[PDB]
């Protein structure tokens, strides 16, 4: 209950809220059902419209106007944002050449650049390049300041996920908006797009922009705008906030527009009905940068053009059922539309079984236009887990469609010819970024990169200090003109172990048989150099990698490889190999099918051991390093090494042997060489940072071997592929993937073929960055290259998307 008896005089957009029960007079009051009841008359006039005309020029004050036209008013803060073109014959900021700005051009008593954030809802990236024609605001900003081709959304592609993670560089997964629809099971409680629900702030996690500045000393305008404030009265809202005294004046703003979502849901992306809400965004930058130009601002603030997602074609004719699958259709809950997901109808059932409910819906039709998953075996590069408000079982919805629970669902609810929320890296979900000001560079095209990136360049361009988040600060340096942070590599906390033969081959007892008995001097120093570290310069071309948290491991040399193993997890962390575009793959000879071999620089006590793969008849071993690739007949025997083998499914030694026997030689074929670092990641509490030995839920059976969750690889090569991976003097090519070590090939509906059919589509669902592998392993890459510190940084957040 508010008493709403009170008045706006003096306070129409005040920046501090008054707290119940006085009445409120800012954006948010609207939404409350709390404005004074003076609030629409004083605060939101409409009279005259929006544009000075000559015959206003000079006009006398009239208070009940819109905007003014008054000789008055530029310094009361409040004239139409044209009124200098009309009344003063001065240009459009669109009409003005593009001038460098190399220093901020800012009034005395102005600290810092002021920072605006210009968010469209819906903005699908192609829009620059096939609605350039009618936004020529934006194109100015696009063409003068620093722009990619595109930004990458977060999962899901909707709204509330994505501006809360601009707002805060955290995935959903740890901000807590982990769809535009939720249920949370400990708030019993729905968090919808409609209601008063989604205004509790149980619901919004980490520590947003906003409340950043404002800790530190920064002054913040509100990020939210209600519906019914016309995007012309939120212009000249900023522009006014902009000419308070310097000691009341916000540093940052935020402005949104619900075009062009709105009406791309209703027409589709391309409908003949997008050009007009096109257009109307131009001008509306158009508006606020005119409202600049006037108060002396234009070369003082940062302006950032950002979108939330992009928009697909999607229409109520491609819609799967449930109902089509399930039998029990009426026990589940499905929140729907371009993701599913699904949980029990009722905690009140330990009749429910996931298990039955993933397998009804396992490539069941030829066509199926979702595949489910459970969440934990969702693409890592999702980030779309760890939290208790995501259903245990997901959907992913191919792009275009649609799922539903039944038929009745969808027309006792075609409306819709748009959508989006589909997987993060599907063309039609990308996004736009313009940063245009004195602290973005000129004139220059920086590559794509993810939306998460972008609040460590806010508090950046702000002075302040960003608060922990999953960005990767540095990454986006190359944006800037003049950067404040400088990053450093992170500190090694292990130093390895170097062990030379201090074991004799019957000190072992591991059940290991090899065929390798068969006995030169040239070639007896020869090999000794090998395991002192001889062609460690040709396998490791970027340092070795340093481990970051306490443990204990040994550098093991090679002729054909280098790996750090775990004394503690009984295994490699890490396995590094180049293979040039001359190298021959050979088999494994049938003498050494079962051939593994005791390595006498490790103790029995610290190696894995064949009885327990004998034992455990679920289980099965691989190699890191590959037989296939040795080097010589010789070498090949380093291979069979206990130390380069690793727990691994039958099911995932068929995805496994077909990347190492055919796809690293291609590769290596195609970029002219390339260098593999491949390892194991555990990751049983799916939080996407590397457990702790403790946090193990599986072992080869009867022994201390961990099983991993996922298997990774990092690919390496010369940018420039004229040069060989292993003599490049430039910029480095990277992809990396990291795959689930799973005990089938459920996921993959084509799996009963040939792995030429399938396994390379599966790798490419579960490419990775390599950041995201430094996080599930706790090591750094890249640690001695001839490249800037910022550049790798930005090599590390590529991802690589085979999207065409
Ligand atoms: C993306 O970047 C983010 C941000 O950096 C990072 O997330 C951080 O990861 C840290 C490690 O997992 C974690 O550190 C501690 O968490 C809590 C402190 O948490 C509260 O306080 C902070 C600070 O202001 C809050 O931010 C945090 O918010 C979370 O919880 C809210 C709901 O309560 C929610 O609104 C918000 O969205 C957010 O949700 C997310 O995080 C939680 C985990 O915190 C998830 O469960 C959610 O699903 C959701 O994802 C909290 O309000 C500490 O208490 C922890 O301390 C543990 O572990 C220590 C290890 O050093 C150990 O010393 C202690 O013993 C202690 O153990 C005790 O508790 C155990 C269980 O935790 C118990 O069994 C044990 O026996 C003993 O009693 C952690 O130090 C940060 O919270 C987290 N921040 C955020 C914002 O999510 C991500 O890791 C990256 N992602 C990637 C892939 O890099
Ligand atoms: C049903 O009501 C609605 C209301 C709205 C809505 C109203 N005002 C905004 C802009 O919010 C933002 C704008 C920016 Cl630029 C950033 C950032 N950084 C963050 C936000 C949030 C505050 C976190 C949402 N939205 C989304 N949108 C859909 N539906
Ligand atoms: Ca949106
Ligand atoms: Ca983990
Ligand atoms: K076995
Ligand atoms: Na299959």
Known sequence: WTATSGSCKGRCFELQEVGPPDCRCDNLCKSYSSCCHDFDELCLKTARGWECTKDRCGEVRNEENACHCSEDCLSRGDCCTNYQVVCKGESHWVDDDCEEIKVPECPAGFVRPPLIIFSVDGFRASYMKKGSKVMPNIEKLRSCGTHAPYMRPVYPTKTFPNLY???????????????????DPVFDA?????????????????????????????????????????????????????????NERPSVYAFYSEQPDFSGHKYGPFGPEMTNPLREIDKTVGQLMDGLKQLRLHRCVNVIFVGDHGMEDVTCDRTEFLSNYLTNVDDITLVPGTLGRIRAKSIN???????????????????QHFKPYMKQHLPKRLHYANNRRIEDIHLLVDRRWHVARKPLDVYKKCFFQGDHGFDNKVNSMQTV???????????????????????????????????????????????????????????????????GIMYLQSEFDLGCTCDDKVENKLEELNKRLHTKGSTKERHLLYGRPAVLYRTSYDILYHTDFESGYSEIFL????????????????????????????????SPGFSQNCLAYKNDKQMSYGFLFPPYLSSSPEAKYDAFLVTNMVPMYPAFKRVWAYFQRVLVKKYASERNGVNVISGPIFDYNYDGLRDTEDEIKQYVEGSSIPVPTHYYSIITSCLDFTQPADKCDGPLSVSSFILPHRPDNDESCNSSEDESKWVEE???????????????????????????????????????TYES
């Open 762 to 800: 599966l790798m490419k669902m579960h490419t990775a960055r390599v950041r995201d592998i430094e996080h599930l392993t706790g090591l750094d890459f890249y640690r001695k290259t001839s490249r800037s510190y910022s550049e790798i940084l930005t090599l590390k957040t590529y991802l690589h």
């Open 165 to 183: 993670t601009l707002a805060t560089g955290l995935y959903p997964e740890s901000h807590g908006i982990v769809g535009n629809s939720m249920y």
């Open 190 to 246: 729905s968090f919808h797009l409609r209601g008063r629900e989604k205004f509790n702030h149980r619901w919004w996690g980490g520590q947003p922009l906003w409340i950043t500045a404002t800790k530190q000393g920064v002054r913040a305008g509100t990020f939210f705008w209600s519906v019914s404030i016309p995007h012309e009265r939120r212009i000249l809202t900023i522009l006014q906030w902009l000419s308070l005294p310097d």
């Open 349 to 367: 059932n330990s009749k429910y079984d996931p298990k039955t409910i993933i397998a009804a819906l396992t490539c069941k039709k030829p066509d």
């Open 571 to 602: 295994m490699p962390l890490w396995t590094s190999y180049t293979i040039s575009k001359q190298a021959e793959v050979s088999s494994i000879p049938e003498h050494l099918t079962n051939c593994v071999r005791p390595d006498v620089r490790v």
């Open 433 to 499: 970024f313009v940063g245009y000001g004195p602290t973005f560079k000129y004139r220059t095209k920086v590559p794509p990169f993810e939306n998460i990136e972008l609040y460590n360049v806010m508090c950046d361009l702000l002075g302040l200090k960003p608060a922990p988040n999953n960005g990767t600060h540095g990454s986006l340096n190359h944006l800037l003109r003049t950067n404040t942070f400088r990053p450093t590599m992170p500190d090694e906390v292990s130093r390895p172990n170097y062990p």
